[PDB]
Structures are given as C-alpha cells and as structure tokens.
C-alpha cells in the first residue's frame, strides 16, 4: 500500500484516518476523517518533494512508515512496531546509545493525550518526535518529554491572543464556558491566570455537559443546558469564551437559540474556531459576533495537484475525500527532519555519505536546525516550539466569500496582536460592543469596591472640604489644606478668606 516507501532512512508517521475488553478494536469500525487523510498526504508530498530536491539529500532516499491511530484507543502497538529492528524483535537493555530502530524519527499523533502517551515510551530511546497540532502547555517540560518537539504554538500564545483581543476593544468583563475534558479545564485555568495580570475579570466560569450531536439527550442534561443559558442571560457580561470540542456545541447553541438569546461576542478556541458543521447552522448569524483564534494558513505550492500487518490499509479514504491550516505544520516537520539528517550525515551538494545514524544523535541535530521554508523561518525555541503566526478570524455567512475572514494576526516572538482590521459587529450602527462591569466615574467621584472583582465599584461624590486627585488615588478622598475648601465633587481646592 501507499502507507510505505522504502529508502535509506525511514520516517514514522501517526495520523488518525478514522474517527468486551477481549475484543480487539479495529479502525474500520469508525467513519473516515478527511483531515487526517489530508495530513498524511501532506507528509507524503513533503517526503517525495525532498526526494526530488537534489540539493537537500543528494543520493539519499527518505522512506516512511505511516500507521493509522484511532486517537487514544491504539497508541502502544505502532510505537513497538517503529522501535523493533531485527525480525520485528526489540531488545531490552540498560543503554540504547548503540541501537538502531526501524525509523529514525516520528511525525507524532494529534491529540495531546496520545502525544504524551507516545512520548513517555519514546523517551526511553530518545527517538525524536515532532508533533503538529497538540497545543497543550505541559509538553514544554523537556525533563518530562526530552525528545518531543512541535511545529505549532502552544496554548500560551492562544490565550495571549485572546487576552490582547479583549484589551484592544477594552472588554473588562467576560464569561468562560469549558468542557468537562482536560482540554477545557486546562485552558480555563490558563485564561484565569492570564486575565488577572492584565486587568480583566471573569464574571463566572461554567462547565458544559459531554453531549454528542446525533444522540438523544436526557432530561437532566437538557435542564443543565437550560441553567447555563439562564446564567448567561442574567449576567451583564456579553463576551463569552468557549473551550470545548466542536461536536459538543451543537446542542448548546440549539438551546441558546431556543431561548432567543442574542447580542454577545463569542470567542472560539482553535478546537472549534473553524468548524464548518457549526458554521452551516444558518441561525448562528443572529446570536451575535463570532471571533475565532487559530493558526494562520500557509499555502503549499504544488500540493493541490499532488492530492487530487495492521492499520496500514485503509482504501475508503479516497471516495470519502472526493486541513489547510494544519498542513504546513506537517510539511515543515518533515522538512525539519530532512535538514537535521542532512546535517547529521555531514552531507553536501552531490556528495552525501550513507553513515549509520542512531536516533539520539538526530534529536541533537533536530534541536539545531534553522532554515527558511516556503518564505517562513522555522527553528525550535528551547522549549521545543516553532514560532508560527496565529490569526483571528470572523465568521461570515455571505457565501460570495470565504466562511472565515481574517481580522487580525498575532506574532509569538513579538508576542503581540497586530494588523487588526474592520470587524463588522452586530450592533445597531456597527459600533464596538462593550462589556464593562461598572461605568466609569465622573471627575471628583471616588470608587467604592463591590464584592470580589476589581472591576466592581460604586461611584461616590467627594464631600466639601475634600478632593480627589486622579493622578494620585481614586479609592478615597483626601482633605483640603487648612485654609482651603472645595465644591463637593471636585478635583481641586480653593482659598477661603
């Protein structure tokens, strides 16, 4: 099958092509997922293009061994298959510095849980793993995951983009909805950490139930959704951040529509920011403004005309097909491994030598690459991440143009949001919608805090004989000099006779 190419050195690839404990599960039980097929084709295009490029690996062939993984449900077997050498046998020994595996590097899984699972196994051998879509911040620990790298930013930068979007439009007062998953809780906690340093108050955080879109919903789950939407309706906050997988939100937004809720700004995380299934729900355009934070697209030139004993034969993908924003991560991962190998072999144009390589040295070289690919400079931060651009997209429903329209771009090395464009709002006159917990003071009014959140305060007039200096304090009045007085709520003193 096309899952395999022979060569002098082989890359391993893990992609999810498909969506009684004694019964062994099989991927064919699940429907095809086209995104994973696109990513597989991205890897194949990258490797064959590298084989065509005489200036990168002259006379050396990159092969590959690609294996389908049903997300978390099969992660052990492919790793053993990659690690074994002679007669599909894998020796157990204390020191592996002299051992050669079937593959020299792995283009690792998609899900953060599966990435960690594979990393804990490959860490024993220091076989390098590069991953393309796992944004979890925990992967930055190289004591815990020494051999793992990423061609994508982490949740740190997504939350930074969210918070700077909030700051730019001066939103002080937000709501956070999270899934029950580790993903939702992780991102909710991270956002809670980030906002407190920047002056943004979370009105309340609430957890969505783990529903599935086609299946029936129980009465208590329906009531749970009703309660959450009631909390949304009662609150004065109108900026809502949702950390949930896309499949779960169909029921939630159906309930929101049923209650005739409208007038919010919805901030989408990368896990649902660009979902067509949610987008095609025609009535979402009436709930408010949808903004989504996602990795920025990079077009591969030649890719379109190229595209159009187990777990290596899945014929159903083609007719299911008949991932643009993630493709570049896989492409650049393959190119990173290729450049690291080109360095490791001591190679030069038309003058390669086919030296025997042990993966732990290729890891050391992979940490060292720095080159321009497709007009972007890709190199690994010491914490293992490549600095690719993020973007903010607004959902549009005019089918004359693309569903998701870029409205801002974020730079992780400069760590700031830039090139903001004209968002078209739901407001009556295209004015920026504002969410603030309390209105700003008149001059000569002191703030009196209310409750826990910093943004909550009463505005109270200064009494005669006292004044408020906004450059000096705002939470209590200060007295006039012994021969001065003031006009009650006033910033300044005046002389008594």
């Amino acid at each position: 099958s096309d899952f395999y190419l022979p060569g002098d050195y082989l890359l391993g690839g893990l992609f999810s092509l498909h969506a009684n404990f004694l019964q062994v599960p099989m991927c064919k039980e699940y429907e095809v997922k086209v995104i994973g097929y696109n990513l597989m084709q991205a890897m194949r295009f990258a490797v064959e293009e590298i084989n065509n490029d005489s200036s990168l690996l002259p006379g050396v062939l990159l092969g590959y061994e690609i294996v389908d993984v049903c997300y978390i449900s099969n992660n052990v077997q492919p790793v053993l298959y990659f690690l074994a050498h002679e007669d599909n046998l894998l020796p157990i020994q204390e020191d592996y510095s002299n051992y050669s595996s079937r593959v020299v590097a792995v283009i690792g899984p998609d899900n953060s849980e599966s990435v960690m699972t594979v990393a804990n196994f490959l860490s024993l051998f220091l076989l390098p793993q590069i991953t393309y879509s796992a944004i979890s911040d925990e992967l930055r620990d190289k004591v815990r995951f020494p051999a793992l790298l990423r061609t994508t930013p982490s949740a740190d930068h997504h939350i930074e983009a969210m918070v700077q979007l909030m700051l730019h439009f001066r939103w002080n007062w937000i709501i956070v909805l999270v899934s029950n998953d580790t993903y939702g809780r992780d991102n909710g906690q991270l956002l809670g950490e980030r906002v407190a340093r920047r002056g943004i108050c979370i009105a309340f955080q609430e957890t969505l139930p783990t529903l599935q879109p086609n299946q029936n919903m129980t009465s208590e789950e329906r009531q749970r959704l009703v309660t959450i939407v009631d909390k949304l309706q009662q609150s004065t906050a109108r900026v809502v951040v949702v950390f949930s997988p896309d499949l779960t939100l169909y029921h939630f937004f159906n309930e929101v529509l049923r209650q005739n809720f409208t007038g919010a700004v919805w901030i989408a995380s990368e896990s649902w920011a660009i979902d067509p299934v949610l987008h095609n729900l025609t009535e979402l355009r009436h709930l408010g403004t949808f903004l989504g934070i996602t990795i920025q697209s990079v077009p591969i030139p030649g890719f379109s005309e190229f595209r159009e004993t187990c777990n290596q034969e899945c014929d159903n993908c083609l007719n299911a097909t008949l991932g643009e924003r993630v493709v570049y991560s896989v492409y650049s991962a393959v190119y990173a491994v290729a450049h690291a190998l080109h360095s490791l072999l001591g190679c030069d144009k038309s003058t390669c030598t086919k030296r025997v390589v042990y993966p732990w040295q290729l890891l050391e070289e992979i940490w060292k690459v720095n080159f321009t690919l497709l007009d972007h400079q890709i190199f690994f931060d010491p914490q293992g991440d490549v600095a690719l651009h993020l973007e903010i997209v607004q959902w549009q429903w005019d089918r004359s143009q693309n569903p998701f329209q870029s409205v801002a771009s974020y730079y992780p090395l400069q760590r700031q949001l830039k090139n903001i464009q004209d968002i078209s709002w739901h407001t009556i006159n295209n004015t920026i919608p504002m969410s603030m917990c309390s209105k700003r003071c008149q001059s000569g009014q002191k703030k009196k805090p209310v409750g826990i959140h910093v943004c909550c305060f009463e505005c109270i007039d200064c009494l005669p004989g006292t004044f408020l200096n906004h450059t000096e304090d705002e939470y209590e009045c200060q007295a006039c000099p012994n021969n001065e007085w003031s006009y009650q709520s006033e910033t300044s003193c005046f002389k008594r006779q």
Binding site: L90, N120, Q234
Partner: protein, 524 residues
Amino acid sequence: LCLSQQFKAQGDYILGGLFPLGSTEEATLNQRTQPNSIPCNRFSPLGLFLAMAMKMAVEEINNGSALLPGLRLGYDLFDTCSEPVVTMKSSLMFLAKVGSQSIAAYCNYTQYQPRVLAVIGPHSSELALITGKFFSFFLMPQVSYSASMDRLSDRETFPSFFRTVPSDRVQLQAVVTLLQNFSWNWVAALGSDDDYGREGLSIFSSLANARGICIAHEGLVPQHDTSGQQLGKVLDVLRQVNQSKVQVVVLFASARAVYSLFSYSIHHGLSPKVWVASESWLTSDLVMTLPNIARVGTVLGFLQRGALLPEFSHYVETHLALAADPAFCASQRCPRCDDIMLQNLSSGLLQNLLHHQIFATYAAVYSVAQALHNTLQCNVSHCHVSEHVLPWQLLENMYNMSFHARDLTLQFDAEGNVDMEYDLKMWVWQSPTPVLHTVGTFNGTLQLQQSKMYWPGNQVPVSQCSRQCKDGQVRRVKGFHSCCYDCVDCKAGSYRKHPDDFTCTPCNQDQWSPEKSTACLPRR
C-alpha cells in the same frame, strides 16, 4: 545485609512488583540527552516495607492450602526509582518471553506469553497512569495499592487496572456529605498544582455544584517555594480566601503544598478557619511538624478504615536478621538497600499510623491469588494443572470475584475499585501534641458523634449564602459560578423597580419611598 537478593523467588506462577525501593537527589533531574542508564543514588525504606508486605503475603499463601493447593507462587520485584524511564524498563522486562531478552512487536495480546502473571503496581498515580496505559495493550492485570487518582477508573483506557484503595471520588463524596450535613453552603476550594490537586478540584467542583454547595473561590497552590511568583500566588490565594468572607476551606493538596501554604499563612497571620483535609495531607508525613499548627484554626478530614497486620513488624525484623546471617546466605536491584541494618528500620517508623498501604499491598497479593484460584477451578487439594494460565485469561475472572484479606472481604467493582469505609478524624490540640481523634464514620452514609465534636468554644462554625432573596430586596450574584446571592436592602428614597438584580431606582421627585418598599408613594 544481603537484602536485595530476597526480591526474586521461583514458582509455578510469578507476580511482578513495582515499588519505590530507591530514589535520587534533585540534581539528577536535568534534561536527558544520551540514552544511558540511571544510577541508584538513594535508598528508600517505604519501598522496602511494602516489598516486605508482598513477600509476607506470598509466603502465607505458599503455607496455607486455602489458595492454590499444591502450587508454588513466586515473585519478581523491581524498583520504580520514582522515574518513568526506569519504570518503563522494568515494565518491558515483565512482558518479555521467559528466558529471552527481547520483546516482539505482535499486533494483538493473544500472541504474547509474558514471564509474569500479574503486576502489583506502582506507588504513585503518575507511574500508575503511564504503566496502566502500557499494560492495557497486553491486558496484563495490574493491581495498585496506592494510586487513587480517579482518571484510572476509566475502563476504556485502563481495561486491566485494579486497585485495593478507593478512588478520590469516594473521599470527595464523603467531604460533600460532610459539608451538606453542617449546612456549610459557602466555601472555598483549594488544590495543589499537581495533577492530583487539579483532578481533585475538578471532581469536587462537579460534585458540590450538584448538591447546592456554592464555591466562593476555586484556586491552585504551588508545590514549590523557589520563585517570587509563588510567594505572590500564595499571598493572592490568602487575599481571595479573606475577601470572600469564607469560614470553611476545602484543601485537596499534597503535603508539601499544604506545608508551604500553612507556613506562609502563619507568616501573614491569617485568622482561624475550618480546613477540610485530604488523606495525603491528613496522614502528615510533613505538615504536622510546623511549630504553630493550632493557630491555623481547625483541621478535619476522612481516613481509610482498613484492617491491620499484627505480625508484620516481627516478620520484617526476622527477615532482616536472616539477611544479616552469612550461614543463611550460604544457602543489584537496589545496591543501597544492602547497606541497611535493623536499627535503620526501627519499629518507631512502623508504629506511626504506613498501615493503610502495607495492608493494601497484602490485599493486592491476595486478590491476584484468589483470581488465579478461581481461574484454575481449584478444588480442595487439587487444581486444573493440565494447562498454563495467561494473564488475559485471569483478567476475565478478576472482575467477578470476592477475596479475603485478614478477616475482611473485598470485591473489585465494574470500574476496578474496592469499596471501603472511612473514619472522620479531627485534630485535637488540647493534648500537648496534635493527635487524630475519630469523630465519625462514612460508609456511603455519614454518621457523626456530634457530642464528641471538638469545636473551639461552645459553638459550631457557619458559612452560608442566600439561595433566594426576600421580596423587598435586590439580588446580586456571587461565587465562582453564579450560584448564590448577597442581598441589598433598598434604602428610603429608592424603590425596587424589578424583582431582579437591577439596582434600586431613585425615587420620583413628586413622590417618596420608605425602607424596603417596592414603589414610589404620593407624599401628599
């Protein structure tokens, strides 16, 4: 002593063991850059005691014909070194064909033939997650004596993991019942930044929200005391606990985190609060050393109710003595273990409280042995000897059994957990040293000996919030979730325009309004 040689024994069937028999200083924990071996730097007595418990259980089983009559049961114990790499090496060694030094990449479990029948799993939950995920592919049955994190209950990712200790969810259900009994509606929830504490906070926040307990603040406290951000974070947590006016705090945190939090709380002079503890702190390997515990205000929490092993100390001393005798030895996995004498393992260590984990190890051995006894369809004095059992065959019986520890029946449920009772322990400071007193029990229902409760003064603490307001009041939501309200009384000259959160409106000029009134009134 020739002690590390006692970690392997022959038999017809063999049990693997993962124990914290050694460790290393922090200086070792740099990034790994070449795949060399990791040395045995430091000894650990806890692992030795747990290994002794497993050895004792297997010795008893080999003496008493009640289980596996006519067969000999062996063991093969390895150190985790508290290190995933070393743990993975040991796990791989367990799964290799007997006599061989390698493992084969077959596609499904039925093609393997590992050298051990079952693995008595690691001490910590991190290694439990890792090794459970690895073992599940081979359907190797794994029984843990210490790993309580509830994520391991999932049969989809952990189809072969079992434990003889309850999961955190049962402890937190007991805690929720405790809060519900004393009507502590308004509380703060804290947890350690480790996965233990994060999952604990998730579980508690899910359970409390369903029963109407309103969490004022939900936050994480760090494991370490080495950066200014951590000092600031504990100061901010103290600020949150103070400003919310909470009097009862639930603290699902590891002992190091609690030690940090309490030391800084004493440093900053926090006022007394009720602190609801978790087992890993309440058993206090570290916290109870603090000079000024009694100022923290009150400590209370649940603890396991398992049985006890009277003979264990004499067994340990006897076998250390045997390991000290060259005439016995005439008949490494931890080189530092050989340097240890009886006086280094004094009885004062065993008389403390480690009984729970020691008994859990004993019971894990007995669970595996009973499961094998069932699989071999044993009679009195006879067995189905004509075949050799593979681990995945034992797994079928292990779900559908009851096994006997010392005068205590236990059963694995559909999620691989045991069911166990709890004591409710309260710290008493009227003694010249803090000591645990039993004040209640939990067995799915909470029984309190309230006449015995040691509250400060002749009063019981309270912390509450309004679920609904009166008619003549304006609402205001509070809490980490918008669950409950604080009430505003409308002062004269203003009126409650809406029966809602909307602030009271100033009175119409040609009218007036008295206190608490809902409308403007003609002044005449």
